[PDB]
Amino acid sequence: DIFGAIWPLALGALKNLIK
């Protein structure tokens, strides 16, 4: 299912947090 496009998203969110 949609388990590849939602990955780069959560990763980009944790980056703007403290990265």
Side-chain angles (χ1 to χ4, degrees):
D1 223 298
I2 301 147
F3 294 125
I6 188 104
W7 251 50
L9 182 116
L11 293 165
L14 298 175
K15 212 268 294 222
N16 275 110
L17 164 58
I18 54 172
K19 324 204 148 265

